[PDB]
Amino acid sequence: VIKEFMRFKVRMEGTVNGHEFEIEGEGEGRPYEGHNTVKLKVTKGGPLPFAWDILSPQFSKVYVKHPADIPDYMKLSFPEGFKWERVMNFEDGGVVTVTQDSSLQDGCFIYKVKFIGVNFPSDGPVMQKKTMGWEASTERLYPRDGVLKGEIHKALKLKDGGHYLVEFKSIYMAKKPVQLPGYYYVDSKLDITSHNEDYTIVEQYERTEGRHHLFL
Amino acid sequence: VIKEFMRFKVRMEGTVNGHEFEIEGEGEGRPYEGHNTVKLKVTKGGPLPFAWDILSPQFSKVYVKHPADIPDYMKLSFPEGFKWERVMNFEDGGVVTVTQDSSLQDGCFIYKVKFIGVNFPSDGPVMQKKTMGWEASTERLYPRDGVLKGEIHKALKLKDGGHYLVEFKSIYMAKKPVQLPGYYYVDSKLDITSHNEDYTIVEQYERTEGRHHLFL
Amino acid sequence: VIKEFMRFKVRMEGTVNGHEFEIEGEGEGRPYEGHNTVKLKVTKGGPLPFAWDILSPQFSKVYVKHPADIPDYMKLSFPEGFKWERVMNFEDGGVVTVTQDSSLQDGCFIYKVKFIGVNFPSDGPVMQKKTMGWEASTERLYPRDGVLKGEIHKALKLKDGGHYLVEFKSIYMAKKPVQLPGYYYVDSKLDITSHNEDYTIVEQYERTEGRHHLFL
Amino acid sequence: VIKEFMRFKVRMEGTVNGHEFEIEGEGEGRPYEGHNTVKLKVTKGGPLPFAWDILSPQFSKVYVKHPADIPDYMKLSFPEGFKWERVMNFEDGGVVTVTQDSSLQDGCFIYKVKFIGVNFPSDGPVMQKKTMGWEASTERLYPRDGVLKGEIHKALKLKDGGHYLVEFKSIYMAKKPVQLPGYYYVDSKLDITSHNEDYTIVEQYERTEGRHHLFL
């Protein structure tokens, strides 16, 4: 089911400080290689009155390349697929909850995302759009409650210098029982490859890979 | 616009640990008296596989009775009305984000709610339904970022003894500039007055009042 | 043991962002009335390079006046007395942990405090001394783990307007088993009554009382 | 000042849920190689009624091996040295604040540590000693407030399976202005190499190295 080259389609319904929007996208990648790209477009509520960056990481777990000896949980879940949940805790008080459903369709992945962002200060980096993409990150994963959980200490680069910090807490839930891995790490690097002027059309590229701690 | 006896209608679209649902309700109360009731019904995704209690507080700020000398922010916002946002931080890791829109229609209030609950342990009190209503609470309010903010240290009563703690962080945003109050408190008491067997039809009653700290 | 008028002595060893200090004090009050005062003096590391306010609440649980029907936990612990622990979570990242021992001596209470404050931004309100006392507060108490626990959403008044928020989490531990109360509240009001120029000599007055939620 | 082989001495005064203790130790290592060992002994309040593991990471930043192009902040601070501060946030509510002073003496490093642990559930893994060492970790570092800050998502291995999670937040402060680095990572692996029966005498070995994100 999981071919060496695959594509997906995504749809997102979001709310950021009372502001509604919807996004639609299409992406594709190399599941076994840990590469993926997606092209999104704001189909409703655009142009966004906030930093696109907070939405970026919400657009593909099946493409994480894993070592032989680390169970490939998300993949294994195929083809019934899995669900994903997330909490984003911003240093200035901003809180985001995300819920996503991942399926297989006609050979194509289908991502459905729900997103709620609240408590972002009107003058902060998200509402004032002062962010300039994320630094590359390392997620710490572990099995818990019969599912796969992971946390990341991420940071957005600030247009005028410095960083705006965000802690990610995520939950990966196979739709059918599948083998869980142990304590591991996932290195990621997401880049906004291009976008129109008002961020109503954006393209991203993500490089992501699973592994053990270097000192092991 | 704000008559001494009013009614409202509510609709909620929610997600709890991957589980979708929709609720519809109708309530009514005495805005100046700080009393309100609502009757809800699960119109989609029922019966809920989780504690109804976590949804309860999401079903009416305009009914808070305020003292003469404390600006009545939510009321004042009428009739354009206001928006409300919330974060619920559960002691076991559960996180909920809520976004709500409040309007005036034909003399009737209209509440629209979006809700995302994630990271609730499968064996915890929410997913296992071991809760038995909330204790009465005291919210600490203050003006910030040109809006009204409030926090509460709440607790759900556990069927078998003890409490499950939840911290509420809320943001109230007038749709038009209106007078903000200073540092104050709001005492609340929400009761599930009745419900069918599978919590698909529920009725609540809430008593809520604004005030200054007792020692002032 | 707990006379209607009593006095205590206190000593504190603290650290705030790498800065050591010691304080010594003497206070006295009316345990049954919920009033107490203390006079402190910086005996080491003064004058403090930070806001005195963060130290204030660390200087007397036995003086909380309680209603007849609410067990008087701290008092009951007498005369073996009890221990108290606390976490202070500041909105800008500042974190404080406090550990205190309370005893009875020759008819006089004896408070011993250890205090560690870290992660306070160099330009924030604590390190820049922009605070102007606390607003009056309401602590939410409950029995847990065989002890008494309480949380408060507190706020320091800012010299130039606005508030700096702090969440208190405290643990009260009787040195001998004594009767615990249920879910209750404690209203407090602490005032810096006077102080020398460089805050090396300060006097505070605290009014504190236990009670049930108003709507009960 | 920083020879290729150096040794240090450490002393710690701590408090864990009302329990006092003091530790003294001696260690030594290869600063440029990122290796260090220390041998500790409980000199006061032993045997500890809690998991030794929570104390372990508190016993040597100067030994982190850094790449050529990543400023060696802690080292550079020599010989005036630096201070370090930390917050440890345990998933079950446990909170620890630590403050440490690092100096150079007669060619030997001198570490002074203050430690306050509070809110650990009586039946949790720390108070019941169910931990079995830490997994290896990755700290995310960045310059902020003119100092070096870092966060880690760490985990203690549980004797009977599973993990107990802890988030570390640390602050590194050069005693004299020195060059700060940018956004980087530090991989660590701390092992309890041996200990007596009642953890009153323990030896640890730590391997730690600085680097850039793999995908850079």
Per-residue three-class SS string for D84-134? EEEEEEECCCCEEEEEEEEEEECCEEEEEEEEEEECCCCCCCCCCCCEEEE
Residues 6+ apart with CB under 8 A from A177: none
Strand (E) or helix (H) holding D75:
helix D73-76
Q: Count of residues for chain C?
A: 216
Give the 3-state secondary structure of A76-137.
HCCCCCEEEEEEEEECCCCEEEEEEEEEEECCEEEEEEEEEEECCCCCCCCCCCCEEEECCE
Name subunits touching A (3+ CB pairs < 8 A): B, D
- Residues with Cβ within 8 Å of C102's Cβ and at least 6 positions away in sequence, in order, are C61, C62, C74, C81, C82, C83, C84, C109, C110, C111, C112
Q: Could you tell me which chain A residue has the CA closest to the CA of D140?
A: A153
Task: Give Cα separations from C115 to B71, C153, D127 (angstroms).
Answer: 40, 20, 21
H/E segment holding residue D73: helix D73-76
Measured between CA atoms, how close is A40 to chain B, in angstroms?
23
B129 to chain A, closest Cα gap in Å: 17
Query: What is the separation, in whole angstroms, between the first and last Cα of chain B?
Result: 33
* B116 token code pair: 């995302």
Instruction: Provide the b/e sequence for B175-190 (b: ≥16 CB within 10 Å).
Output: beebebbebbbbbbbb
Residues across chain D: 216
Joined together, the tokens standing for residue B115 give: 């809700």
Q: What is the DSSP letter of A60?
A: -
Closest chain C C-alpha to D103 CA, distance in angstroms: 13
- Token output for B113: 């709610």
Nearest-angstrom CA–CA distance, A58 and A190: 11
The phi and psi torsions of C135 (rounded to 5 degrees) equal -70, 165
CB-based contact D28:D111 (threshold 8 Å): no
* Ranges of H-type helices in chain C: 73-76
Q: Is A161 exposed, middle or buried (0-12, 13-18, 19+ CB in 10 A)?
A: exposed
Q: How many CB atoms lie within 10 A of CB C216?
A: 11
Residue among C129, C148, C105, C125 at smallest CA distance from C199: C129
The Cα angle at residue C174 between residues C168 and C175, in degrees rounded to 5: 130
Residue type at D14?
A: G
B136 in contact with chain C, both atoms CB, cutoff 8 A: yes
**How many CB atoms neighbour CB D45 within 10 A?**
16
Provide φ and ψ at A73, rounded to 5°: -35, -55
Place of tokens 């709310």: A15
Q: Coil, helix or strand for D20?
A: strand
What is d(CA C54, CA A152) in angstroms, rounded to the nearest whole number? 31
Cβ neighbour number for residue B58 with a 10 Å cutoff = 20
3-state class (DSSP) for residue A58: helix
Q: Which of A144, A187, A215 sits opposite D189 (nearest CB)?
A: A215
**What distances in angstroms separate CA C190 from CA B168, C146, C193, one per listed residue?**
25, 28, 9
Handedness of CA C108, C114, C119, C123 (dihedral sign): positive
| Separation of alpha carbons C94 and A39, rounded Å | 41
**Contact at 8 Å (CB) between D41 and D200?**
yes
How far is C-alpha A20 from the geometric centre of its chain's CA atoms?
Answer: 19
Nearest one of C133, C127, C190, C179 to C156, comparing CA atoms: C133
Residue B191, strand partner residues: B205
Q: How many CB pairs under 8 A join A and B?
A: 71
Give the Cα separation of C166 and C90 in Å (integer). Answer: 4
For residue B142, CA distances in Å to A46, B103, B164, B210 come to 32, 23, 26, 12
Q: CB–CB of A179/A147 below 8 Å?
A: no
Radius of gyration over every alpha carbon of chain C, rounded to an integer in angstroms: 17
Query: 3-class DSSP state for residue A33?
Result: coil
Cα–Cα dist B148/B150, whole Å: 7
Query: Cα D69 to the chain's mean position, in Å?
Result: 24
Secondary structure of B19-88 in the HEC alphabet? EEEEEEEEEEECCCCCEEEEEEEEEECCCCCCCHHHCHHHCCHHHCECCCCCCCHHHHCCCCCEEEEEEE
Q: How far is CA B67 from the centre of its chain?
A: 21
Beta-bridged to residue B143, according to DSSP, are B148
Q: In whole angstroms, what is the distance from residue B209 CA to residue A84 CA?
A: 39
Burial C107-144 (b: 16+ CB within 10 A, else e): eebebebbbbbbbbbeebbbbeebbeebbbbbbbbbbb
- Which of B136, B153, B188 is opposite residue C153, by nearest beta carbon? B153
Give the count of Cβ contacts less than 8 A between chain A and D: 69
Q: To the nearest 10°, report the CA torsion of A74, A78, A83, A86.
A: 20
- Residue C207: phi, psi to the nearest 5? -110, 120
Please report residues of C whose CB lies closer than 8 A to that of B152.
153
Q: Which residue type is seen at C207?
A: R
Closest Cα in chain A to D216: A136
Nearest CA in chain D to C115: D116
Whether the CB-CB separation of D14 and D41 falls below 8 Å is answered with: no
Contact D137 A140 (CB under 8 A): yes
Residue A75 gets which letter from DSSP?
A: H
In contact, C26 and C9? CB cutoff 8 Å: yes
Copy the structure tokens of residue C84: 């108290």
Cβ within 8 Å of residue D114, ≥6 positions away: C15, C116, D12, D13, D14, D98, D99, D100
Say which amino acid occupies B103. S
d(CA C151, CA B135): 15
Q: Which residues contact D9 (CB under 8 A, 6 or more apart)?
A: D25, D26, D27, D105, D108, D109, D110, D111
b/e A90-108 (16+ beta carbons within 10 angstroms → b): bebbbbbbbbbbbbbeeee
C-alpha closest to that of A128 among A207, A51, A52, A213: A51
Q: Which chains touch B (3 or more CB pairs under 8 A)?
A: A, C
Q: Which amino acid is at B80?
A: E
CA torsion angle for A211, B119, B147, B183 (degrees, to 10)? -120
Please give the structure tokens belonging to residue C14: 């603290």
Tokens 């108070």 belong to D127
**How far out from the chain centre does Cα A69 lie?**
24
Euclidean distance between CA atoms D48 and D57, whole angstroms: 16
Cβ atoms of B125 and B155 within 8 Å: the answer is: no
Chain C interface includes D123 (CB < 8 A) = yes
Nearest neighbour of A136 by CB, restricted to D136, D167, D216: D216
Topology at the third CATH level for domain D1-216: Green Fluorescent Protein (2.40.155)
Cα A149 from Cα A144, distance rounded (Å): 6
CA pair distance A13, A172, nearest whole angstrom: 20
Cβ atoms of A95 and A126 closer than 8 Å: no
At A76, give phi and psi (nearest 5°). -45, -35
- Which candidate in B97, B115, B142 is best for mutational testing of the A interface (most A CBs within 10 A)? B97
Measured between alpha carbons, how far is residue C94 from residues B152, C17, D34, D97 in Å?
Answer: 21, 9, 30, 11
Tokens 């409040």 map to which residue?
B102
Q: Is the dihedral of CA C20, C25, C31, C33 positive or negative?
A: negative
Cβ separation A95–B99 shorter than 8 A: no
**A185 interfaces chain D, CB cutoff of 8 Å:** yes
The partner residues of B50 in beta bridges, in order of sequence, read: none
Angstrom distance (rounded) from CA A98 to CA A61: 14
CA C212, CA A24: separation in Å to the nearest integer? 52
Give the nearest chain D residue to C149 (CA atoms): D119
- Distance, CA of A109 to CA of C32 (rounded, Å): 69
Q: Cβ contacts (< 8 Å) between B167 and chain C: which residues?
A: 151
Residue C28's DSSP bridge partners are: C7, C37
Spell out the residues 6+ positions from residue B93 whose beta carbon is closer than 8 angstroms to its own.
A169, B119, B120, B121, D91
Cα–Cα distance, A19 to D168 (Å, whole number)? 34
A153 in reach of chain D (CB within 8 A): yes
C213: nearest CB among B136, B151, B183? B136
- The conformational region for residue C178 under phi > 0 = left, psi -120 to 50 = alpha, else beta, is beta
How many inter-chain contacts (C to D, CB under 8 Å) are there? 71
Tokens 């053990």 locate to A212
The region, left, alpha or beta by phi > 0 then psi within -120 to 50, assigned to residue A133 is left
As a whole number of angstroms, the distance between CA B191 and CA B126 comes to 18
List the resolution, Å.
2.0
CA distance D209 to D83: 20
User: Does the CB of C128 have a partner CB in chain D at under 8 Å?
Assistant: no
Residue C16: partners with Cβ closer than 8 Å, 6 or more residues away: C48, C49, C50, C54, C115, C117, C120, C126
Does the N-terminal peptide bond of residue D79 adopt cis geometry, omega within 30 degrees of 0?
A: yes
C-alpha distances out from residue D122 to B91, C179, D54, D119, Å: 17, 18, 15, 9
Q: Which of A112, A107, A87, A89 is nearest to A97 (CA)?
A: A87
> Which has the closest alpha carbon to C79: C108, C51, C58?
C108
What's the residue count for chain A?
216
Set of chain C residues whose Cβ sits within 8 Å of the Cβ of B214: 187, 209
Nearest to A87 among B15, B95, B114 (CB): B95
Tell me the C-alpha distance between B117 and B123, whole Å: 15
